[PDB]
């Protein structure tokens, strides 16, 4: 369970998300990693899944994000697609739907994905010889 390939599914999704600039990757999410490290692994995934869900719900039809061009509209749809896939995988990992996230700090979505990526790669590394 712990070292399941969902880890890889999440990482590969993170690679696509961070190699991807849009109009709205600088918009913010609550920085659940501004905590002082106080929670289990399932709480962490649940919290990450929560704030990402917050983001895609709120920015899927956001006029600031939707795009003028074909390419901008394509990239926005891509992003929302990848957040949902990531989110799906995080929730599957979390095994938990209810978890209060209490942080004041916001980071850009972009910074938050890089941080989640680091942690995910660390989990994988810890699993692997």
Numbering used by the authors: 1 to 129
Paper text:
Interleukin 4 (IL-4) is a pleiotropic cytokine that plays a major regulatory role in the immune system. Signal transduction of IL-4 is mediated by a sequential binding process, initiated first by binding of IL-4 to its high-affinity single membrane spanning receptor chain IL-4Rα. This intermediate ligand receptor complex then recruits one of two possible low-affinity receptor subunits, the common gamma chain (γc) or the IL-13Rα1 chain, into the functional hetero-trimeric complex to initiate signalling. The overall structure of IL-4 comprises the known four-helical bundle in up-up-down-down topology, which like the crystal packing is unaffected by these mutations.
We tested the interaction model proposed above by mutating Arg85 of IL-4 and the super-agonistic variants to alanine and measuring the residual binding affinity to IL-4Rα. Changing Arg85 of IL-4 to alanine does not change the binding affinity for IL-4Rα dramatically (KD (R85A)/KD (wt IL-4) ~ 4.7-fold, thus ΔΔG = 1 kcal mol-1). This is in line with the observation that residues in Cluster III do not generally contribute to the overall binding. In particular, the dissociation rate constant is only increased by a factor less than 1.3, showing that the hydrogen-bonding network of Arg85 with IL-4Rα provides no free binding energy. To exclude the possibility that structural changes in addition to the removal of the Arg85 side chain play a role in the changes in binding stability, we determined the structures of the IL-4 variants R85A, T13D-R85A and F82D-R85A. No changes in the local structure around residues Thr/Asp13, Phe/Asp82 or Arg85 could be observed (data not shown).
